[PDB]
Structure formats: structure tokens, C-alpha cells
Design a protein around this nucleic acid. Structure first.
Length: 49
DNA sequence: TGCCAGAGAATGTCGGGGAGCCGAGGAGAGATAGCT
């Protein structure tokens, strides 16, 4: 009826989160929030791993 | 190994200590009106 969805995109050193409260049956929904957490690696580690 | 920290290169600004001007009280130098 009312659904809580937590979408996570986990990169090499980045984490994107999105929490949303939605109602699919009525095509009704609002976004609770989203954010990005960045773990700082230099480009050398990205090209080396 | 990409990128961080700092060397490196052009500027512009400012103390600072001599150079050179230059305002100012004061002394020769005299025309001169009060005096004889």
C-alpha cells in the first residue's frame, strides 16, 4: 500500500543512497531524500586496482 | 604514477638613507628724510 524503498549504488569509492516513500497503486510518491558519500582515493589507486 | 608541496619567475610596493632643493633669520649696502 505504502512502500519504503532504499536504493544504493556502490561505486569503487563512492556510495549513493536514496530513500523514497511511494504508493505504486495510485501513481503517488514523494522522495524522502538522497545523498552521496565519497571516500577520497586519488586517481592512482583507481587506475591501479 | 598522478598529484602535492614548494621552488621558480614577473610584478608592484615600501622602508630608508643619501641628493638636491629650498624657506628663513640675519648681515653688507645703500637711497633717503630728519636733522643741523
Amino acid at each position: 500500500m505504502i512502500k519504503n524503498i532504499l536504493g544504493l549504488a556502490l561505486g569503487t569509492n563512492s556510495i549513493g543512497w536514496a530513500l523514497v516513500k511511494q504508493d505504486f497503486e495510485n501513481k503517488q510518491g514523494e522522495i524522502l531524500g538522497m545523498g552521496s558519500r565519497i571516500i577520497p582515493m586519488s586517481q592512482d589507486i583507481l587506475g591501479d586496482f
